[PDB]
Design an enzyme around this catalytic site. Structure first.
Site, PDB file in Angstrom:
ATOM      1  N   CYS A  70       0.813  -1.224   0.000  1.00  0.00           N
ATOM      2  CA  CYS A  70       0.000   0.000   0.000  1.00  0.00           C
ATOM      3  C   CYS A  70       0.849   1.278   0.000  1.00  0.00           C
ATOM      4  O   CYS A  70       1.496   1.607   0.997  1.00  0.00           O
ATOM      5  CB  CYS A  70      -0.968   0.045   1.186  1.00  0.00           C
ATOM      6  SG  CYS A  70      -2.180   1.409   1.080  1.00  0.00           S
ATOM      7  N   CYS A  74      -0.114   3.882   2.541  1.00  0.00           N
ATOM      8  CA  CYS A  74       0.311   3.539   3.893  1.00  0.00           C
ATOM      9  C   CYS A  74       1.796   3.769   4.180  1.00  0.00           C
ATOM     10  O   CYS A  74       2.147   4.407   5.176  1.00  0.00           O
ATOM     11  CB  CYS A  74      -0.050   2.082   4.214  1.00  0.00           C
ATOM     12  SG  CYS A  74      -1.816   1.679   4.140  1.00  0.00           S
ATOM     13  N   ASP A  75       2.661   3.282   3.292  1.00  0.00           N
ATOM     14  CA  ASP A  75       4.109   3.376   3.500  1.00  0.00           C
ATOM     15  C   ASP A  75       4.889   4.320   2.584  1.00  0.00           C
ATOM     16  O   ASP A  75       6.105   4.481   2.740  1.00  0.00           O
ATOM     17  CB  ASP A  75       4.722   1.972   3.410  1.00  0.00           C
ATOM     18  CG  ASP A  75       4.102   1.002   4.400  1.00  0.00           C
ATOM     19  OD1 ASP A  75       4.327   1.168   5.616  1.00  0.00           O
ATOM     20  OD2 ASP A  75       3.387   0.077   3.967  1.00  0.00           O
TER      21      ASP A  75
HETATM   22  C1  FAD Z   1       1.552  -3.548   3.527  1.00  0.00           C
HETATM   23  C2  FAD Z   1       0.342  -3.000   4.261  1.00  0.00           C
HETATM   24  C3  FAD Z   1       0.556  -2.164   5.382  1.00  0.00           C
HETATM   25  C4  FAD Z   1      -0.540  -1.610   6.071  1.00  0.00           C
HETATM   26  N1  FAD Z   1      -0.372  -0.618   7.122  1.00  0.00           N
HETATM   27  C5  FAD Z   1      -1.434   0.351   7.243  1.00  0.00           C
HETATM   28  C6  FAD Z   1      -1.148   1.659   7.747  1.00  0.00           C
HETATM   29  O1  FAD Z   1      -0.033   2.118   8.032  1.00  0.00           O
HETATM   30  N2  FAD Z   1      -2.252   2.488   7.825  1.00  0.00           N
HETATM   31  C7  FAD Z   1      -3.529   2.155   7.456  1.00  0.00           C
HETATM   32  O2  FAD Z   1      -4.458   2.973   7.500  1.00  0.00           O
HETATM   33  N3  FAD Z   1      -3.745   0.908   6.984  1.00  0.00           N
HETATM   34  C8  FAD Z   1      -2.719  -0.006   6.866  1.00  0.00           C
HETATM   35  N4  FAD Z   1      -2.991  -1.240   6.275  1.00  0.00           N
HETATM   36  C9  FAD Z   1      -4.214  -2.019   6.540  1.00  0.00           C
HETATM   37  C10 FAD Z   1      -5.169  -1.776   5.411  1.00  0.00           C
HETATM   38  O3  FAD Z   1      -5.276  -0.366   5.203  1.00  0.00           O
HETATM   39  C11 FAD Z   1      -6.517  -2.477   5.373  1.00  0.00           C
HETATM   40  O4  FAD Z   1      -7.236  -1.813   4.323  1.00  0.00           O
HETATM   41  C12 FAD Z   1      -7.327  -2.518   6.689  1.00  0.00           C
HETATM   42  O5  FAD Z   1      -6.766  -3.439   7.627  1.00  0.00           O
HETATM   43  C13 FAD Z   1      -8.731  -3.014   6.375  1.00  0.00           C
HETATM   44  O6  FAD Z   1      -9.560  -3.212   7.509  1.00  0.00           O
HETATM   45  P1  FAD Z   1     -10.718  -4.309   7.509  1.00  0.00           P
HETATM   46  O7  FAD Z   1     -11.249  -4.348   8.877  1.00  0.00           O
HETATM   47  O8  FAD Z   1     -11.699  -3.945   6.471  1.00  0.00           O
HETATM   48  O9  FAD Z   1     -10.101  -5.724   7.013  1.00  0.00           O
HETATM   49  P2  FAD Z   1      -8.870  -6.698   7.411  1.00  0.00           P
HETATM   50  O10 FAD Z   1      -7.921  -6.003   8.308  1.00  0.00           O
HETATM   51  O11 FAD Z   1      -8.340  -7.349   6.173  1.00  0.00           O
HETATM   52  O12 FAD Z   1      -9.505  -7.832   8.376  1.00  0.00           O
HETATM   53  C14 FAD Z   1     -10.428  -8.818   7.951  1.00  0.00           C
HETATM   54  C15 FAD Z   1     -10.813  -9.708   9.093  1.00  0.00           C
HETATM   55  O13 FAD Z   1     -11.943 -10.528   8.759  1.00  0.00           O
HETATM   56  C16 FAD Z   1     -11.552 -11.893   8.899  1.00  0.00           C
HETATM   57  N5  FAD Z   1     -12.227 -12.755   7.903  1.00  0.00           N
HETATM   58  C17 FAD Z   1     -11.952 -12.956   6.564  1.00  0.00           C
HETATM   59  N6  FAD Z   1     -12.729 -13.857   5.988  1.00  0.00           N
HETATM   60  C18 FAD Z   1     -13.574 -14.270   7.027  1.00  0.00           C
HETATM   61  C19 FAD Z   1     -14.606 -15.237   7.084  1.00  0.00           C
HETATM   62  N7  FAD Z   1     -15.034 -15.928   6.008  1.00  0.00           N
HETATM   63  N8  FAD Z   1     -15.184 -15.416   8.296  1.00  0.00           N
HETATM   64  C20 FAD Z   1     -14.798 -14.705   9.357  1.00  0.00           C
HETATM   65  N9  FAD Z   1     -13.864 -13.781   9.424  1.00  0.00           N
HETATM   66  C21 FAD Z   1     -13.276 -13.607   8.198  1.00  0.00           C
HETATM   67  C22 FAD Z   1     -10.041 -11.911   8.802  1.00  0.00           C
HETATM   68  O14 FAD Z   1      -9.498 -13.063   9.473  1.00  0.00           O
HETATM   69  C23 FAD Z   1      -9.680 -10.614   9.521  1.00  0.00           C
HETATM   70  O15 FAD Z   1      -9.752 -10.682  10.949  1.00  0.00           O
HETATM   71  C24 FAD Z   1      -1.866  -1.902   5.654  1.00  0.00           C
HETATM   72  C25 FAD Z   1      -2.060  -2.745   4.536  1.00  0.00           C
HETATM   73  C26 FAD Z   1      -0.987  -3.297   3.818  1.00  0.00           C
HETATM   74  C27 FAD Z   1      -1.293  -4.078   2.554  1.00  0.00           C
END
Ligand code: FAD
Ligand code: FAD
Lengths: 316, 316
Positions: free
Chosen positions: B135, B138-139
């Site tokens: 991302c 992000c970085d």
């Molecule tokens: C290299 C990298 C660095 C990052 N660092 C940052 C940063 O500095 N700042 C920032 O803002 N963002 C950062 N992010 C995180 C990123 O922005 C994500 O978009 C964010 O974590 C999304 O939040 P979310 O809750 O939607 O999903 P996710 O964090 O992807 O979490 C999904 C959750 O749902 C669960 N899940 C999946 N399928 C199922 C299922 N069938 N049943 C039950 N549970 C399930 C997973 O196990 C997980 O717990 C980074 C991303 C990357 C790629």
């Protein structure tokens, strides 16, 4: 008379404004943020905040904002202490007129907010932060299983009462009129909870005074009826004033598309969601959100605006 | 075989899932959250995070999530360690099938995420968190004024390169093909920055290895051309892998309306924005956002889903 120009200009120093600043700053856009009169926004007028993701304990509006500000300054955001009193968004660059001078920009982010209006009573003023609140979603859980009162007479009020009726042991809705001016569904649901539920109506009543002790609100005094000075005291732990909000958008009248005072954004799921009716102008926070009104949602839209502005400024 | 029923069920333990939990918990909905395989979501796979509003210093993905989890547990959120492998959202209550058992609910919040796909190389794996990222937003600022590389061949890749070209001193776009499959505008802008700017194209190239030292990526090795093993090393401080993401929505195929794998939400500015095609089912975070993809935006939508679910469950 000074006329300062920045690529990106942000209006507002609340959650929305500061988050937009950190995202724009970390995007290398060298943002300038105009604080407005109330440095820190609504959160500075509050005490405990336990719904900010990641801060389960010991957080206050002031502490959160102080942190927000520090984060914005860490990335060399230029913070200007002023307040815009006039703008022209029909010409490029955009021109905003403050008290310290005029400002121009290639992209603008409006995060001016929408503060709540209160009753204006001295007692109410005395209990703000210690019993008197303006957001159920924010302070409602504090009154879980306790008696609570909500004063208002429209959608905002009924909505607060409805939201509180699943948290408080009782909800006393108060209004000067005999009925509530809200949309049919809310009225039906309100009446369901009245006919057989958590809500006790107090129509044709005026809030004369908010009473309490060193810890907080303990009661509320009501009067009036009909050609009679019939008075009634209510034991209550909290008072939610729900008479309405005032979106800071006067300066934008006739310039942007507004909806009940709120700035209309494109929204959607295909990007450029914070875009206003004017290409290059974006809105975030309360000023464009009359449904959630949370710091986290405000910071989210703040983030989006910075990213939308970035893509816009880069001709995408 | 167990069949557990909760009024509200949340899927996912990332920012979106946890925030939805705190808002639902503080709404008195007694939420149950299924963690999924990766407890903590994408943030656990990362190190430093300096774009989370209010945390200017010393924050990491793991630390943020640990705090998110604690906040969710403080409000008595029932955390269940499982992963849903099948669902039926066409009947009431909704039915989800996990490994520990089956679950039913009156309202559902999907916050399953959309993780990034990598190249699968051993060297790349070695440098994740120390040079290799997925991302730019992000970085990217970490590589301000330094040489950077982005590998991909579509919209996602070009977008990353474009966003990096205003932050890095150089942007090396790498692809196995001769051209990039992106939308005309991005291609024009990309070419403007190539013809006279920050971007250096590296088409018809394959990433053979990611090289670096104890501090991070210092280079990247490329090869191929056309019927020739022409090799070229590039001095680079960071590698952004931009080949695409995988929205966790297989389980929802034929059940919900999807857009390129993403769950379509109502969006808009009139409430019930996280609503999916099915009344009572809501989506938050990455799984429904392919534009911003930030923890703050994810937490914002997480907040909204909880509030939308609340109003839904209350018949509003
Ligand atoms: C290299 C990298 C660095 C990052 N660092 C940052 C940063 O500095 N700042 C920032 O803002 N963002 C950062 N992010 C995180 C990123 O922005 C994500 O978009 C964010 O974590 C999304 O939040 P979310 O809750 O939607 O999903 P996710 O964090 O992807 O979490 C999904 C959750 O749902 C669960 N899940 C999946 N399928 C199922 C299922 N069938 N049943 C039950 N549970 C399930 C997973 O196990 C997980 O717990 C980074 C991303 C990357 C790629
Ligand atoms: C009683 C109460 C308690 C609260 N506690 C919580 C809580 O526990 N949790 C939570 O999530 N939320 C809380 N909130 C805050 C609330 O949720 C707001 O919705 C939030 O602060 C909005 O963020 P914002 O950035 O959009 O606007 P605001 O915080 O209102 O900030 C607006 C900023 O823009 C400036 N401005 C205004 N006009 C101009 C102008 N013309 N030129 C320049 N600058 C201008 C203002 O001076 C201010 O700095 C509370 C609200 C109330 C009513």
């Amino acid at each position: 008379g000074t006329t300062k120009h920045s690529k990106l200009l942000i209006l507002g120093s609340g959650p929305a404004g500061y988050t937009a600043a950190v995202y724009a700053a970390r995007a290398n856009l060298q943002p300038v943020l105009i604080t407005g009169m109330e440095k820190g926004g609504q959160l500075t007028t509050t005490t405990e905040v336990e719904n900010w993701p990641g801060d389960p304990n010991d957080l206050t509006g002031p502490l959160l904002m102080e942190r927000m500000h520090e984060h914005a300054t860490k990335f060399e955001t230029e913070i200007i202490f002023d307040h815009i009193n006039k703008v022209d968004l029909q010409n490029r660059p955009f021109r905003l007129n403050g008290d310290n001078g005029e400002y121009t920009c290639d992209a603008l982010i409006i995060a001016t907010g929408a503060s709540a209006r209160y009753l204006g009573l001295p007692s109410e003023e005395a209990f703000k932060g210690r019993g008197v609140s303006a957001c159920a979603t924010c302070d409602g859980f504090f009154y879980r299983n306790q008696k609570v009162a909500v004063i208002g007479g429209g959608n905002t009020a009924v909505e607060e009462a409805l939201y509180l009726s699943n948290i408080a042991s009782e909800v006393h809705l108060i209004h000067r009129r005999d009925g509530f001016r809200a949309e049919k569904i809310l009225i039906k649901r309100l009446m369901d909870k009245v006919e057989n539920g958590n809500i006790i109506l107090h129509t044709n009543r005026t809030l004369e005074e908010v009473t309490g002790d060193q810890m907080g609100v303990t009661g509320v005094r009501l009067r009036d009826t009909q050609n009679s000075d019939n008075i009634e005291s209510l034991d209550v732990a909290g008072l939610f004033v729900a008479i309405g909000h005032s979106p800071n958008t006067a300066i934008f009248e006739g310039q942007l598309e507004l909806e009940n005072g709120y700035i209309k954004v494109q929204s959607g799921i295909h990007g450029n969601a914070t875009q206003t009716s004017i290409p290059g102008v974006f809105a975030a926070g309360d000023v464009m959100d009359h449904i959630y009104r949370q710091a986290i949602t405000s910071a989210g839209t703040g983030c989006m605006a910075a990213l939308d502005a970035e893509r816009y400024l880069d001709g995408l």
